[PDB]
Short mmCIF file of all heavy atoms in Angstrom, two decimals:
data_model
loop_
_atom_site.label_atom_id
_atom_site.label_comp_id
_atom_site.label_asym_id
_atom_site.label_seq_id
_atom_site.Cartn_x
_atom_site.Cartn_y
_atom_site.Cartn_z
N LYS A 10 4.43 -11.18 15.49
CA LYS A 10 4.19 -12.56 15.91
C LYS A 10 5.43 -13.15 16.58
O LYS A 10 5.35 -13.76 17.64
CB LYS A 10 3.79 -13.42 14.71
CG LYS A 10 2.64 -14.37 15.00
CD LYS A 10 1.35 -13.61 15.27
CE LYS A 10 0.44 -14.39 16.21
NZ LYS A 10 -0.42 -15.36 15.47
N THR A 11 6.59 -12.95 15.95
CA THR A 11 7.84 -13.46 16.48
C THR A 11 8.78 -12.32 16.87
O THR A 11 9.27 -12.27 18.00
CB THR A 11 8.56 -14.37 15.46
OG1 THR A 11 8.96 -13.60 14.32
CG2 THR A 11 7.65 -15.51 15.02
N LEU A 12 9.01 -11.41 15.94
CA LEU A 12 9.89 -10.27 16.19
C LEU A 12 9.23 -9.28 17.14
O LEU A 12 8.13 -8.79 16.88
CB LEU A 12 10.24 -9.57 14.87
CG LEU A 12 11.01 -8.25 14.99
CD1 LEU A 12 12.22 -8.43 15.89
CD2 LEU A 12 11.42 -7.75 13.62
N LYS A 13 9.91 -8.98 18.24
CA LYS A 13 9.39 -8.05 19.23
C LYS A 13 10.50 -7.13 19.75
O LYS A 13 11.66 -7.53 19.82
CB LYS A 13 8.77 -8.81 20.41
CG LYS A 13 7.92 -9.99 19.98
CD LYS A 13 6.95 -10.41 21.07
CE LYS A 13 5.60 -10.80 20.48
NZ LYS A 13 4.63 -11.20 21.54
N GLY A 14 10.13 -5.90 20.09
CA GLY A 14 11.11 -4.95 20.60
C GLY A 14 10.64 -3.51 20.46
O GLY A 14 9.52 -3.26 20.01
N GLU A 15 11.49 -2.57 20.86
CA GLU A 15 11.15 -1.16 20.79
C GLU A 15 12.33 -0.34 20.28
O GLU A 15 13.48 -0.79 20.31
CB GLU A 15 10.72 -0.64 22.17
CG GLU A 15 9.95 -1.66 22.99
CD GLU A 15 9.49 -1.11 24.32
OE1 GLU A 15 10.36 -0.85 25.19
OE2 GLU A 15 8.27 -0.94 24.51
N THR A 16 12.05 0.86 19.79
CA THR A 16 13.08 1.74 19.27
C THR A 16 12.67 3.21 19.38
O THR A 16 11.57 3.52 19.82
CB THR A 16 13.40 1.42 17.80
OG1 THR A 16 14.58 2.12 17.39
CG2 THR A 16 12.24 1.81 16.90
N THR A 17 13.57 4.10 18.98
CA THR A 17 13.30 5.53 19.03
C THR A 17 13.84 6.24 17.80
O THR A 17 14.72 5.72 17.11
CB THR A 17 13.91 6.17 20.29
OG1 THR A 17 15.28 5.77 20.43
CG2 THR A 17 13.14 5.77 21.54
N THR A 18 13.32 7.43 17.53
CA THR A 18 13.75 8.21 16.37
C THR A 18 13.56 9.70 16.62
O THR A 18 12.59 10.12 17.25
CB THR A 18 12.99 7.81 15.10
OG1 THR A 18 13.65 8.33 13.94
CG2 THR A 18 11.56 8.32 15.14
N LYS A 19 14.49 10.51 16.11
CA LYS A 19 14.42 11.96 16.27
C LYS A 19 14.05 12.63 14.95
O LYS A 19 14.84 12.66 14.01
CB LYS A 19 15.75 12.50 16.77
CG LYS A 19 15.82 14.02 16.80
CD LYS A 19 17.00 14.53 15.98
CE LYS A 19 18.32 14.03 16.53
NZ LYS A 19 19.34 15.11 16.59
N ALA A 20 12.83 13.17 14.89
CA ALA A 20 12.36 13.85 13.69
C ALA A 20 11.80 15.23 14.02
O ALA A 20 11.41 15.49 15.16
CB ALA A 20 11.31 13.00 12.98
N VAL A 21 11.76 16.10 13.02
CA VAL A 21 11.25 17.45 13.20
C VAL A 21 9.75 17.51 12.96
O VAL A 21 9.15 18.59 12.91
CB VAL A 21 11.95 18.45 12.26
CG1 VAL A 21 11.74 19.88 12.74
CG2 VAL A 21 13.43 18.13 12.15
N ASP A 22 9.13 16.34 12.82
CA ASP A 22 7.70 16.25 12.58
C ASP A 22 7.23 14.80 12.57
O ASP A 22 7.93 13.92 12.05
CB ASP A 22 7.33 16.93 11.26
CG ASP A 22 5.83 16.94 11.01
OD1 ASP A 22 5.07 16.84 11.99
OD2 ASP A 22 5.43 17.04 9.83
N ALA A 23 6.06 14.55 13.13
CA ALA A 23 5.50 13.20 13.18
C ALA A 23 5.39 12.61 11.78
O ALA A 23 5.36 11.39 11.62
CB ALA A 23 4.14 13.22 13.86
N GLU A 24 5.32 13.47 10.78
CA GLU A 24 5.21 13.03 9.39
C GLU A 24 6.54 12.50 8.88
O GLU A 24 6.65 11.36 8.44
CB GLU A 24 4.72 14.18 8.50
CG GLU A 24 4.79 13.87 7.02
CD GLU A 24 4.35 15.04 6.16
OE1 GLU A 24 4.74 16.18 6.47
OE2 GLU A 24 3.62 14.81 5.17
N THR A 25 7.57 13.35 8.92
CA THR A 25 8.90 12.98 8.46
C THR A 25 9.43 11.79 9.25
O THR A 25 10.26 11.02 8.75
CB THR A 25 9.89 14.15 8.59
OG1 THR A 25 11.14 13.80 8.00
CG2 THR A 25 10.09 14.53 10.05
N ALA A 26 8.96 11.63 10.48
CA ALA A 26 9.39 10.53 11.33
C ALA A 26 8.79 9.21 10.87
O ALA A 26 9.49 8.20 10.77
CB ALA A 26 9.01 10.80 12.78
N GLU A 27 7.49 9.22 10.58
CA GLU A 27 6.80 8.02 10.12
C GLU A 27 7.48 7.44 8.89
O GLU A 27 7.45 6.23 8.67
CB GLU A 27 5.34 8.34 9.81
CG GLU A 27 4.60 7.20 9.13
CD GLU A 27 3.09 7.41 9.10
OE1 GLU A 27 2.66 8.54 8.79
OE2 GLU A 27 2.36 6.45 9.40
N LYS A 28 8.09 8.30 8.09
CA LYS A 28 8.78 7.87 6.87
C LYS A 28 9.97 6.99 7.21
O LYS A 28 10.28 6.05 6.49
CB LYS A 28 9.24 9.09 6.07
CG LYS A 28 8.55 9.22 4.71
CD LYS A 28 7.51 10.32 4.72
CE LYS A 28 7.38 10.97 3.35
NZ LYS A 28 5.98 11.37 3.05
N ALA A 29 10.64 7.31 8.32
CA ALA A 29 11.80 6.54 8.75
C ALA A 29 11.38 5.23 9.42
O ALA A 29 12.15 4.27 9.46
CB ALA A 29 12.65 7.37 9.71
N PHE A 30 10.16 5.21 9.94
CA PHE A 30 9.63 4.02 10.60
C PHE A 30 9.25 2.95 9.58
O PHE A 30 9.24 1.76 9.89
CB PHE A 30 8.42 4.38 11.45
CG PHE A 30 8.78 4.93 12.80
CD1 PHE A 30 8.14 6.06 13.29
CD2 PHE A 30 9.74 4.32 13.58
CE1 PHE A 30 8.47 6.57 14.54
CE2 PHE A 30 10.08 4.82 14.83
CZ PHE A 30 9.44 5.95 15.30
N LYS A 31 8.95 3.38 8.36
CA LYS A 31 8.57 2.47 7.29
C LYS A 31 9.80 1.79 6.69
O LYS A 31 9.68 0.96 5.79
CB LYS A 31 7.80 3.21 6.20
CG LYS A 31 6.77 2.35 5.49
CD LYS A 31 5.36 2.88 5.72
CE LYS A 31 4.94 2.74 7.17
NZ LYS A 31 5.16 3.99 7.94
N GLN A 32 10.97 2.15 7.20
CA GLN A 32 12.22 1.58 6.71
C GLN A 32 12.66 0.40 7.58
O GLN A 32 12.88 -0.70 7.07
CB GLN A 32 13.32 2.65 6.69
CG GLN A 32 14.57 2.22 5.94
CD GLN A 32 14.97 3.22 4.87
OE1 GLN A 32 15.07 2.88 3.69
NE2 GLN A 32 15.22 4.46 5.28
N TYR A 33 12.77 0.64 8.88
CA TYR A 33 13.18 -0.40 9.81
C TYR A 33 12.32 -1.65 9.65
O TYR A 33 12.80 -2.69 9.21
CB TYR A 33 13.08 0.11 11.25
CG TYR A 33 13.66 -0.84 12.27
CD1 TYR A 33 14.98 -0.73 12.69
CD2 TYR A 33 12.89 -1.86 12.82
CE1 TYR A 33 15.51 -1.59 13.62
CE2 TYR A 33 13.41 -2.73 13.76
CZ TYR A 33 14.73 -2.59 14.15
OH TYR A 33 15.26 -3.46 15.08
N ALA A 34 11.04 -1.54 10.00
CA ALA A 34 10.12 -2.65 9.88
C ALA A 34 10.25 -3.35 8.53
O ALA A 34 10.48 -4.55 8.46
CB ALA A 34 8.69 -2.18 10.09
N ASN A 35 10.12 -2.57 7.46
CA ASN A 35 10.23 -3.11 6.11
C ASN A 35 11.51 -3.92 5.95
O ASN A 35 11.48 -5.06 5.46
CB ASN A 35 10.19 -1.98 5.08
CG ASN A 35 8.78 -1.64 4.64
OD1 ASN A 35 7.81 -1.92 5.35
ND2 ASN A 35 8.66 -1.04 3.46
N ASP A 36 12.63 -3.34 6.36
CA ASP A 36 13.92 -4.00 6.26
C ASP A 36 13.90 -5.34 7.00
O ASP A 36 14.67 -6.24 6.69
CB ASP A 36 15.02 -3.11 6.82
CG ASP A 36 16.32 -3.23 6.05
OD1 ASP A 36 16.65 -4.36 5.62
OD2 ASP A 36 17.02 -2.21 5.88
N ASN A 37 13.02 -5.44 7.99
CA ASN A 37 12.90 -6.66 8.78
C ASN A 37 11.70 -7.49 8.33
O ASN A 37 11.42 -8.56 8.88
CB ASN A 37 12.77 -6.33 10.27
CG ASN A 37 14.03 -5.71 10.83
OD1 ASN A 37 14.99 -6.41 11.16
ND2 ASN A 37 14.04 -4.39 10.96
N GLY A 38 10.99 -6.99 7.32
CA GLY A 38 9.83 -7.70 6.80
C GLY A 38 8.64 -7.61 7.73
O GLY A 38 7.78 -8.49 7.74
N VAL A 39 8.59 -6.54 8.53
CA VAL A 39 7.50 -6.34 9.47
C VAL A 39 6.42 -5.45 8.87
O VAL A 39 6.67 -4.29 8.53
CB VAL A 39 8.00 -5.71 10.78
CG1 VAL A 39 6.89 -5.72 11.83
CG2 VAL A 39 9.23 -6.45 11.29
N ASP A 40 5.21 -5.99 8.75
CA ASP A 40 4.09 -5.24 8.19
C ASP A 40 2.89 -5.27 9.14
O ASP A 40 2.61 -6.30 9.76
CB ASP A 40 3.69 -5.81 6.83
CG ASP A 40 2.99 -4.79 5.96
OD1 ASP A 40 3.65 -3.83 5.50
OD2 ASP A 40 1.77 -4.95 5.73
#
């Protein structure tokens, strides 16, 4: 709604990567 932007991440699998994505957003209160 307010917070907008883009980012990138290097993972050895779409699975292990999604785990790191649940950190950033969460840390910013983005759900």
Side-chain angles (χ1 to χ4, degrees):
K10 223 66 209 274
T11 65
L12 173 51
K13 318 200 140 180
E15 325 182 292
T16 191
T17 49
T18 195
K19 172 237 299 224
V21 198
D22 183 23
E24 170 182 43
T25 186
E27 171 167 44
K28 245 105 149 145
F30 278 134
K31 211 117 293 96
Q32 192 127 238
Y33 188 93
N35 271 23
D36 216 323
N37 293 280
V39 189
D40 204 70

